[PDB]
Amino acid sequence: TGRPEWIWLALGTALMGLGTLYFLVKGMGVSDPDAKKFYAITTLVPAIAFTMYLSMLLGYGLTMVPFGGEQNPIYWARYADWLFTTPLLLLDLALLVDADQGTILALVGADGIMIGTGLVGALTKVYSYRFVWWAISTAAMLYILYVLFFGFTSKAESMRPEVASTFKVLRNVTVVLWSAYPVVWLIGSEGAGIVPLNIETLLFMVLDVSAKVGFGLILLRSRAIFG
Ligand SMILES: *C/C=C(C)/C=C/C=C(C)/C=C/C1=C(C)CCCC1(C)C
């Protein structure tokens, strides 16, 4: 097939794999129980991304959805990735500030809605309705970000500065990166079709790699993960 976006898919696969192995190696050397917890969650995130980037590189996770008078190329494997990686990242943040079970449940649930309506919108055949689903998915994301910014930051204040400071950074990287996904979707192949797929794939790999390996490097190198 040789689609123009394959090189970014190859690069995404490469970065996710390397990040996975490094976290795995670093994770199985640590003896602290809590640190092990964080390591297991954070290593699994890029591990899942790697498998999906690899599948997409190999030609899977792609479907032609008709709308706008065109046969549009929609990479659905992405939602198969995000369905599990986004809540895991959320869990990392939750464990960090000792969030409550109710909070976590509500965040993971909002997250499920976000990815769920996102895919439904990415698969919808009525052009205008694709944006209705997109709109709902974004509303869910803003709920999650609101909670992370207003709820979590507040509870991270019961933690040590080292832990509060690590959370701030992770929270910040998350707010900035996550905020970017809906915009990429809106102007890319799933939406307005302004930004071509090859470029769109490039933007997504940069956000995904930054949001997973970037996020993991920051979290796993901190002393805040220790019991
Ligand atoms: C490793 C992957 C990460 C951190 C992915 C984050 C993905 C999002 C914040 C995705 C958000 C979306 C919307 C707000 C609406 C349209 C569809 C999505 C799923 C692209």
Swiss-Prot record:
The modification N6-(retinylidene)lysine is found at residue 212. Its main location: membrane. Residues 59-75, 124-130, 188-199 are extracellular. The chain crosses the membrane at residues 6-25, 40-58, 76-92, 104-123, 131-150, 169-187, 200-219. The gene is bop. Light-driven proton pump. The covalent binding of retinal to the apoprotein, bacterioopsin, generates bacteriorhodopsin. CDD domains: 7tm_bacteriorhodopsin. This is Bacteriorhodopsin. It is found in: Cell membrane. The record marks 81 as: Primary proton acceptor. Belongs to the archaeal/bacterial/fungal opsin family. It is a multi-pass membrane protein. Homotrimer. Residues 26-39, 93-103, 151-168 are cytoplasmic. One of its GO terms (molecular function) is monoatomic ion channel activity. Keywords: Cell membrane, Chromophore, Hydrogen ion transport, Ion transport, Membrane, Photoreceptor protein, Pyrrolidone carboxylic acid, Receptor, Retinal protein, Sensory transduction, Transmembrane, Transmembrane helix, Transport. GO terms for biological process: phototransduction; proton transmembrane transport. GO terms for cellular component: plasma membrane. SMART domains: Bac_rhodopsin. Pfam families: Bac_rhodopsin.
